[PDB]
Design a protein around this ligand. Structure first.
Ligand SMILES: Nc1ncnc2c1ncn2[C@@H]1O[C@H](COP(=O)(O)OP(=O)(O)O)[C@@H](O)[C@H]1O
Ligand SMILES: Nc1ncnc2c1ncn2[C@@H]1O[C@H](COP(=O)(O)OP(=O)(O)O)[C@@H](O)[C@H]1O
Lengths: 215, 439, 223
C-alpha cells in the first residue's frame, strides 16, 4: 500500500551503501509532453550509468507502465516500451540497480517481471503492532515527550495504519502541543528560542487528540 | 504578557456591540455584566463594547463579532488588550455615513430603515471611525461613524441626535467589506469547521514558524460531500477569515480550455498563489480534472491529472500555500491524489441535520424582514433531506414570492421601489410554505 | 382605484374582457356594459365586460388580440372606465395585413368578416387590429376608419368596406399568429411555474439592483 516507506527504503539503501540515487517520479514523467517524456526517462538511465554504482528509483511505477490494455492511446504504450528497452539496455556491468514501487502487482504490465528486468519482488507490507511502535519511536525522536506518553498504547490503538499515517500522527500531536503553547506565547514573536522550543513537551493527550483525526 | 490581553475567538452572540468573556476572567479583571469596555487591537485601532459572561468561552479568550474584529484590524486567534471603560457618557451628536458600495440601488431615507431600528433602546457604545453593519430591506448596509459629540467615543441613547448627511463615503484600502464570506456566513458544521481552522491555523497565521522547526504542515485538504454543502463557501471563508489570498480553480473551466493551454492555466494558478503568500488555492469540482486513472479516456486528460500531481509535489512546504479541493465523493478522485504530501487531509462536510438547517435558514434570512408567524424552526424540520444551497434558494424563492405579491400592488409607479418601500416588505410564513412546494 | 393588472383570458373572444364580480360592483359596471381600456403608448381599445368569478379582484382577463391594441404584455397595468356613450356605426373600413393574406384569393368578406360580425354587436376602435379564424389560416385586419370616429359598435346595419389593397405591418404591431401561451395546452401547471420564475427578472429587471436576492438564471425543461 502507499505510504509504507517504499520510497524511504530506496532512499536509505542508496545512502547506506554509498550509491548514487536518481529518482524517477511516475506522474512527473507523464506530466511532460510526448517524446520529451521519454527524453527524460532515457536521460535518467544515462545519469545513473554516468555515476555508478547507482540506484534508480521509479516511484508510482503504474503511472508509467500499467497493464498493456489499461493504456489507452499510443504514446502511453510507447513510454512503457521505452522503459523496457532501457531495462534490457541495462548492461549487468553498468553497476546500476533499478528499484521501483507500486501499490500492487496487477497494476503493472507483466512485461516488466521478465527475467533480466524486475525479476525481484519484495513485499513491504503493513506494520504490525510491534512495527508501528518503532515507526512511532522514529518520528518522536526529536520531540520532548511527556512522562504519560505511552507510545506502546498508541501503537495498539492504531490498528490499520501504514508508516506515513503514523508519521503524520506524530506531526499532528506535536502541532497540537504547539498550538496550546502558541496562545501562552503571546508576549512576543518571532521570539521562539531553541530553549523555548525544548520547554515544549508533547502530552499523551496531544496524541489521543491526533488519533481522532487520522485514517 | 499581562493579565489583561486575550485571544480573539468567534462570536456566538451575534450582536455588534457586545463581546463575551469567561466568568472567571471577568472576576479576574473585575468587570461586571453589562460594563462597557475599551478594546485595543492592531494598527493603532480601538473599539468600544459592552461585555457579557459566557460560560462556554475559554478563560484566556474573548468572543467577538466580525464587525468588531474589523474595527480592531484583527483576525481570529490574534491578541487584543481589554480594559474597563465606565467613563463613557451619552452623546448628543453622531454623524454616520453609508459606504458607497453597500448602497448602490437603494433610495431615499435610510435612517428609518436601518439606523433607527438598529438604535431603538440600543444604548450602544460607539467610537469615531467605527464601521458597523445593519441588516434589512434584503441587503446589509455598512455605516462609518465620521464623528461623535463626546469624542472620541460615546453611548447612543434615545436623546442622541443622529445625522446621515447625504453623500455616501468611499471605502478605504484598510477597510474590508462585510458581505465577504466568513465563518458566521456558514452553519450546521462547526465540527468540520473547527478541524479546517486548526489545520490551516499555523501555516497561514504563523508561517515563519516552519523555518524554525522541521515539522511538516498539511499541504492539501480535501472536502467531501454532496454538492451545495458550502464546500466552496468554507474555503472562501477560511481564506478571508485568516487573511490569506484566495485563488479559485474551477474544474470544468479548466477542461474548457484547449489542450496544453489547459495546463498553462493550472500551472499559472500555483504560480499566482506562490507569488501572493500565504494563500489558499481552492480546486472546485476536482473530479472534473482528476478522476480515477481509468475513467480518463484519451491522453490529454491523463496529462492534466499528472500536471496537477507534479504541482502538488512541486509545492514546497516553505511556500506557505494550502491547497483545498472539493468533490462529491472519494471514489471519483484518482487515489494518487491522497498520497502523503498531497491531499493527505480529508474532511467530511456532510448533510446538515435539523439544528444545522435552522442556522442555514437564519443565515439567509438575516437581511429580510420576516413576519411574526414565520417559524424557521418549523421550516428546518420540514426540510428533512436538504443541503445548504437548497435552503439558500428556498429563502430566495420565499422572498421573491413575497415581492411578487406586493409587485401587483406597486402598480402606481416604477422603478419607484425606495429602500423604505423595501423594508415595508415582510415575508410571511405562507411565502415559505409555498416555496417548499417548489424545491 | 380603477387601474388593473392584465391577466390571461379564459373567454377566448376578442371583444370581451372579464372582471371579478366585486370589482364590477366597485366600479359600478353591469354585465354586458361596454368599457374603454387605456394602456401604454397612447393606446386604447373598446370592449364588452363580463363578470368572471374565478378572476382576481385587482386583475382583468383579456385576449392577446386586445393586449396588442393596448400595447401591453401580461401582468401590466391598464385603466378601465365605463363607456355607455358608444353607438352603432354607419361605415367601418377594414383592411387585411399583407403578411396574413399571401396565398388567399378573392372575397375575404364572406369568409372572415361576415361570420365574425353576424349578430356581433362588437365594440371597435379606429386603429384596432383583430384576428379571424377560417379557411385553415388566421387573418389579421386593421380598422382603418369608422363613421362614428373614433369608436363605434357594429350592428347588422353597419356597412363594412374591405377595399382591395392589403396594408403593411407597422413596427409596433406584432403578428397575432405568432406564438403565445394560448398556443399551448395540457400543461398549465408547468406553464405557471415558468411564468413566475421568469416574471420579475424579465418584467421588472431593474428591481434586482435594489435588492440582494438572486433570480433563477437557468431553467431546464424535461420531457
Ligand atoms: N516503516 C516506516 N518507518 C519509518 N518511517 C516511515 C515508514 N513508513 C512510512 N514512513 C514515513 O512516511 C513516509 C512514507 O513515504 P514513502 O517513503 O513515499 O512511502 P511509500 O513509498 O510506501 O508511499 C515517509 O516520509 C516516512 O518518513
Ligand atoms: N452550511 C451552509 N451554511 C450557509 N450557507 C450555505 C451552506 N451550504 C450552502 N450554502 C449556500 O449555498 C451555496 C453553496 O454553494 P457552494 O459553496 O458551491 O457549496 P458546494 O461547494 O458544497 O457545492 C452558497 O451560495 C451558500 O450561500
Amino acid at each position: 500500500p502507499p505510504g509504507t516507506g517504499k520510497t524511504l527504503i530506496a532512499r536509505a539503501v542508496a545512502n547506506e551503501t554509498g550509491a548514487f540515487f536518481f529518482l524517477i517520479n511516475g506522474p512527473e514523467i507523464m506530466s511532460k509532453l510526448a517524446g520529451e517524456s521519454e527524453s527524460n526517462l532515457r536521460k535518467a538511465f544515462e545519469e545513473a550509468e554516468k555515476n555508478a554504482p547507482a540506484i534508480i528509483f521509479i516511484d508510482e511505477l503504474d503511472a508509467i507502465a500499467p497493464k498493456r490494455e489499461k493504456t489507452h492511446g499510443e504514446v502511453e504504450r510507447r513510454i512503457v516500451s521505452q522503459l523496457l528497452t532501457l531495462m534490457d539496455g541495462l548492461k549487468q556491468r553498468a553497476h546500476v540497480i533499478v528499484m521501483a514501487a507500486t501499490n500492487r502487482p496487477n497494476s503493472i504490465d507483466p512485461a516488466l517481471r521478465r527475467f533480466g528486468r524486475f525479476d525481484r519482488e519484495v513485499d513491504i507490507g503493513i506494520p504490525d503492532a510491534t512495527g508501528r511502535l518503532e515507526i512511532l519511536q522514529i518520528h518522536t525522536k526529536n520531540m520532548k515527550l511527556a512522562d504519560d506518553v505511552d507510545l506502546e498504547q498508541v501503537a495498539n490503538e492504531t490498528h490499520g495504519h501504514v508508516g506515513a499515517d503514523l508519521a503524520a500522527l506524530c506531526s499532528e500531536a506535536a502541532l497540537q502541543a504547539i498550538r496550546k503553547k502558541m496562545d501562552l506565547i503571546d508576549l512576543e514573536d518571532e521570539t521562539i528560542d531553541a530553549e523555548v522550543m525544548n520547554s515544549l513537551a508533547v502530552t499523551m493527550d496531544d496524541f489521543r487528540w491526533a488519533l481522532s483525526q487520522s485514517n | 504578557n499581562r493579565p489583561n490581553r486575550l485571544i480573539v475567538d468567534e462570536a456566538i452572540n451575534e450582536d455588534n456591540s457586545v463581546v463575551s468573556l469567561s466568568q472567571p476572567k471577568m472576576d479576574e479583571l473585575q468587570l461586571f455584566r453589562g460594563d462597557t469596555v475599551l478594546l485595543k487591537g492592531k494598527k493603532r485601532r480601538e473599539a468600544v463594547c459592552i461585555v457579557l459572561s459566557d460560560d462556554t468561552c475559554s478563560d484566556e479568550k474573548i468572543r467577538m463579532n466580525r464587525v468588531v474584529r474589523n474595527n480592531l484590524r484583527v483576525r481570529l486567534g490574534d491578541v487584543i488588550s481589554i480594559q474597563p471603560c465606565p467613563d463613557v457618557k451619552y452623546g448628543k451628536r453622531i454623524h454616520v455615513l453609508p459606504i458607497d458600495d453597500t448602497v448602490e440601488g437603494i433610495t431615499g431615507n435610510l435612517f428609518e430603515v436601518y439606523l433607527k431600528p438598529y438604535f431603538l433602546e440600543a444604548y450602544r457604545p460607539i467610537r469615531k471611525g467605527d464601521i458597523f453593519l445593519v441588516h434589512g430591506g434584503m441587503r446589509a448596509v455598512e455605516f462609518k461613524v465620521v464623528e461623535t459629540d463626546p469624542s472620541p467615543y460615546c453611548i447612543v441613547a434615545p436623546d442622541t441626535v443622529i445625522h446621515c448627511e447625504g453623500e455616501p463615503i468611499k471605502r478605504e484600502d484598510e477597510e474590508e467589506s462585510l458581505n465577504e464570506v466568513g465563518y458566521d456566513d456558514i452553519g450546521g458544521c462547526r465540527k468540520q469547521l473547527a478541524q479546517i481552522k486548526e489545520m490551516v491555523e499555523l501555516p497561514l497565521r504563523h508561517p515563519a514558524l516552519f523555518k524554525a522547526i522541521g515539522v511538516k504542515p498539511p499541504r492539501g485538504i480535501l472536502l467531501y460531500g454532496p454538492p451545495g454543502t458550502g464546500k466552496t463557501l468554507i474555503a472562501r471563508a477560511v481564506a478571508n477569515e485568516t487573511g490569506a489570498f484566495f485563488f479559485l480553480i474551477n474544474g470544468p473551466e479548466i477542461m474548457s480550455k484547449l489542450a496544453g493551454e489547459s495546463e498553462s492555466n493550472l500551472r499559472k494558478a500555483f504560480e499566482e498563489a506562490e507569488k501572493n503568500a500565504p494563500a489558499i488555492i481552492f480546486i472546485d469540482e476536482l473530479d472534473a480534472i482528476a478522476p480515477k486513472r481509468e475513467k480518463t479516456h484519451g491522453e490529454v486528460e491523463r496529462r492534466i491529472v499528472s500536471q496537477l500531481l507534479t504541482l502538488m509535489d512541486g509545492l514546497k512546504q516553505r511556500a506557505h500555500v494550502i491547497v483545498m479541493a472539493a468533490t462529491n465523493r472519494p471514489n471519483s478522485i484518482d487515489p494518487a491524489l491522497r498520497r502523503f504530501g498531497r491531499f493527505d487531509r480529508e474532511v467530511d462536510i456532510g448533510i446538515p441535520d435539523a439544528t444545522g438547517r435552522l442556522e442555514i435558514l437564519q443565515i439567509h434570512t438575516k437581511n429580510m424582514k420576516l413576519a411574526d408567524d414565520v417559524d424557521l424552526e418549523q421550516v428546518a424540520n420540514e426540510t428533512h433531506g436538504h443541503v445548504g444551497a437548497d435552503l439558500a434558494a428556498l429563502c430566495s424563492e420565499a422572498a421573491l414570492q413575497a415581492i411578487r405579491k406586493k409587485m401587483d400592488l406597486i402598480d402606481l409607479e416604477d422603478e419607484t421601489i425606495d429602500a423604505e418601500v423595501m423594508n415595508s416588505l415582510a415575508v410571511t410564513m405562507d411565502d415559505f410554505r409555498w416555496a417548499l412546494s417548489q424545491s
